[PDB]
Scaffold this active site. Structure first.
Site, PDB file in Angstrom:
ATOM      1  CB  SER A  75      41.647   6.410  29.217  1.00 51.79           C
ATOM      2  OG  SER A  75      41.190   5.457  28.028  1.00 51.79           O
ATOM      3  CB  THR A 120      43.782   5.362  34.657  1.00 51.13           C
ATOM      4  OG1 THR A 120      44.877   4.671  35.302  1.00 51.13           O
ATOM      5  CG2 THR A 120      42.806   4.311  34.325  1.00 51.13           C
ATOM      6  CB  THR A 122      40.151   6.314  34.890  1.00 53.91           C
ATOM      7  OG1 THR A 122      40.131   5.893  33.467  1.00 53.91           O
ATOM      8  CG2 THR A 122      39.466   5.839  35.781  1.00 53.91           C
ATOM      9  NE  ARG A 178      35.255  -1.430  35.119  1.00 57.14           N
ATOM     10  CZ  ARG A 178      36.395  -0.551  34.888  1.00 57.14           C
ATOM     11  NH1 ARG A 178      36.510   0.570  34.979  1.00 57.14           N
ATOM     12  NH2 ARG A 178      37.493  -1.381  34.785  1.00 57.14           N
ATOM     13  CB  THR A 188      47.668   2.533  35.147  1.00 60.57           C
ATOM     14  OG1 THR A 188      46.907   2.808  34.244  1.00 60.57           O
ATOM     15  CG2 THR A 188      48.862   1.878  34.532  1.00 60.57           C
ATOM     16  N   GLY A 189      46.044  -0.308  34.563  1.00 54.55           N
ATOM     17  CA  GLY A 189      45.765  -1.377  33.921  1.00 54.55           C
ATOM     18  C   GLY A 189      44.173  -2.033  34.099  1.00 54.55           C
TER      19      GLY A 189
END
Lengths: 295, 295
Positions: free
Chosen positions: A50, A152, A170, A180, A203-204
């Site tokens: 990622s 990430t 990331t 995106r 992060t998430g």
């Protein structure tokens, strides 16, 4: 009472990233150099799916990377949706240091990188190409956040001079729509550093960090007297209240914030259990687990 | 006492744009529809050289547009560095309403727009092509912002139901590097809306608004109790401090913030004199001049 130097980074792989950052920090090096060196380790690693090389591509099979960096004196640099360059955090640093702009995206980001001597490379590994072609069979987009699936790396540090800096990089959500962009390259969302206050990185599910301007909120709360941990917790509780207002189910959302203040105190919090972060200071490097809202 | 509906927009052309937004607001329409309609007027106008059609191209001669939109319930949409689509604010709304993402940039943004029925068009007018070729002779990038230069449009409104929404759209800094993105499409920088507090939008040297996460700061200050005017002023003052800390000269920078709270109270502030904003409420449409920091 200041605890320095110290560096924090997200997820299990942040432990290894911290070791590289510590090579700079322990020698009195600048936090800016430490965070760049730290996250570059993960960008270089094909097995970290990622971030950078080996990153899962968008649904069109293209690996597009996002990253931003911020130093101790409000200087910033960011690249989003950039292809063919293995170390976007370094291109972001180049945007910061070598141009009158702070963010370049798409083709223009690559063109700049090339003008700076970065080398064009095929970031799509055989493994990622295989998984992508397999995914194409049903094309079900279902963003999942954890050590497996999406993540990430965000890293923030306080150096020997008492200066803060941070970096975030990331390859974004696997099989995202072409073009995106998530929270990682957006200043105030995936990362924010104010040398008079503290720094924070998230992060998430990026879309959620962008809509709440996550890290700027965390830092501003520290500015308002909150400790790093309380700031991260209050920020999370804000995504929680917001998530409910949008009629969404919290179980489908994961966000973690880690923070550091000028005194080297640190903290973290997340929506759901299972997120961890690595911290390295005079006591050494270790992985810690923060509090979580979803009980 | 609540002053609603009410709409504010940046710069002198905001006066005509407000008339279009008022067509929706005065009929009890949604703030989201009003701000979209309002800024679309400027995107459509070839004579407005820093927004949509007629916008000055990047240094390679490509017109690339940026825009973001935010409604009353934290829903957001954004497009950056998108070509051939006259109304990026509407593609941004489509990103918000029709996809799992909140930001699309470059080729991907155009591809999505086309999938949603938007039509490809030549945004480079004869006038812009002429000026660009003339500029190429010396290629001297000089970021100029004032009453007659780089006037993006940010618009925020409070409708009859008491809901807030905002929109920000631009063609970016004339002769910018290919792929450059400013504050206009970044949530928390060029625009931010929290229905329980207020909304704010920014205009000017975008890089500076991004580095201070401007509108999120303005709204957070209103959350802390600052009046809209006070909030804008303090955000301007934070940029003034940072410009000094970075060893730059404030004379080379222009940023204007306009804001509105849940009660319909409004305000603005800017770095340099010359920036006006337009406000339309039930008493009428007015061109107002806020206070400025550079004395």
């Amino acid at each position: 009472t200041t605890n320095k130097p110290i560096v924090l980074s997200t997820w299990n792989f942040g432990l290894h990233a911290n070791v590289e950052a510590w090579k700079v920090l322990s020698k009195g090096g600048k936090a800016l150099d430490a965070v760049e060196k730290g996250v570059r380790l993960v960008e270089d690693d094909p097995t970290e799916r990622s971030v950078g090389y080996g990153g899962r591509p968008d649904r069109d099979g293209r690996v597009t990377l996002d990253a931003c960096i911020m130093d101790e004196n409000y200087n910033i640099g960011s690249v989003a949706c950039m292809e063919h360059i293995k170390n976007p955090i370094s291109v972001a640093r180049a945007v910061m240091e070598k141009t009158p702009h702070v963010m370049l995206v798409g083709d223009g980001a690559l063109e700049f990188a090339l003008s700076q001597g970065f080398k064009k490379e095929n970031l799509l590994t055989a493994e990622s190409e295989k998984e992508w072609k397999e995914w194409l069979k049903t094309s079900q987009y279902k963003p999942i956040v954890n050590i497996e699936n999406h993540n990430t790396i965000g890293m923030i540090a306080l150096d020997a001079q008492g200066n803060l800096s941070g970096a975030c990089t990331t390859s974004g959500m696997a099989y995202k729509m072409h073009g995106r962009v998530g929270d990682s390259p957006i200043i105030g969302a995936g990362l924010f550093v104010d040398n008079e206050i503290g720094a924070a990185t998230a992060t998430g599910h990026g879309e959620e960090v962008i809509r709440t301007v996550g890290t700027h909120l965390v830092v501003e709360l520290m500015n308002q007297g909150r400790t790093p941990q309380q700031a991260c917790k209050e920020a999370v509780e804000r995504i929680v209240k917001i998530v409910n207002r949008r009629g969404k189910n919290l179980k489908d959302i994961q966000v973690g914030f880690i923070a550091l203040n000028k005194k080297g105190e640190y903290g973290a919090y997340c929506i759901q259990d299972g997120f961890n972060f690595a911290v390295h200071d005079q006591k050494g490097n270790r992985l810690e687990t923060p509090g979580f809202a979803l009980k």
